[PDB]
Amino acid sequence: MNCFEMLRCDEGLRLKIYKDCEGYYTIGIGHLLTKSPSLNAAKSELDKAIGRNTNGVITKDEAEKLFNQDVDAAVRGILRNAKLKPVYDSLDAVRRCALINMVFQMGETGVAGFTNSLRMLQQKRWDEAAVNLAKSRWYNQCPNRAKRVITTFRTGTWDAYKNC
């Protein structure tokens, strides 16, 4: 399993606009369209992002395209963030995927705010990190997904995605 697979397992795939666990209009494989509460805005965003009049629906390849760009964008923000880069560099392959997962979902600035967890991960205090992450709002809003991501940081295995 790799980072992409991990992501695909958590985000799934939708060809029509829907709202994630965060309550935002999203499409394809975890593609955030807008933080705005208006469908019209998301619709606009969609077309803009696509380059054509989608009228609310996209194609599977279109999704795939957005996804590659979104993953690239997650890796890019980590690498450039002074709070994330060192964490990232210090983790093993599987745990790096969990960090990308968080970034992809919440953004560079969101993750960058989990100061203590970040430190704990970097110091290999896996159980401490886990407890800490579970205290967030993120966990209350997207518990299934968050548990999965958390188990990964705690164990460093793919156990949570084994049935995917």
What are the DSSP calls for 143-158, one per residue?
HHHHHHHHHHHHH-SS
Q: What are the CA-CA distances from residue 69 to residues 14, 19, 29 (Å)?
A: 17, 20, 11
CA pseudo-torsion sign 35, 95, 140, 79: negative
Q: Is 153 annotated as a binding residue?
A: no
Catalytic residue among 20, 62, 70, 108: 20
For residues 18 and 97, give the distance between their C-alpha atoms in angstroms, rounded to a whole number.
Answer: 25
**CATH assignment of the domain containing 58:** 1.10.530.40
Quote the domain boundaries for residue 114: 1-164
CA dist 83 and 13 (Å) reads: 31
Phi, psi of 7 (to 5 degrees): -55, -55
117 is in an annotated binding site: yes
45 is an active site residue: no
Residue type for 161, please? Y
Task: Retrieve residue 19's tokens.
Answer: 């709202």
Structural domains counted in the chain: 1
Q: Which residues pair with residue 16 across a beta bridge?
A: 57
- Quick one: tokens of 132? 């800490």
Query: Which of these is catalytic: 5, 10, 11, 47?
Result: 11
Give resolution, Å, one decimal: 2.0
| Residue 2 known to bind ligand | no
Which residue, among 29, 55, 23, 51, has the nearest Cα to 40 in the 3D structure? 55
53 is annotated as contributing to ligand binding: no
The experimental method behind these coordinates is: X-ray
Q: What are the structure tokens assigned to 4, written together?
A: 């992409």
Rounded distance, CA 8 to CA 122, Å?
26
Q: Does residue 20 have an active-site annotation?
A: yes
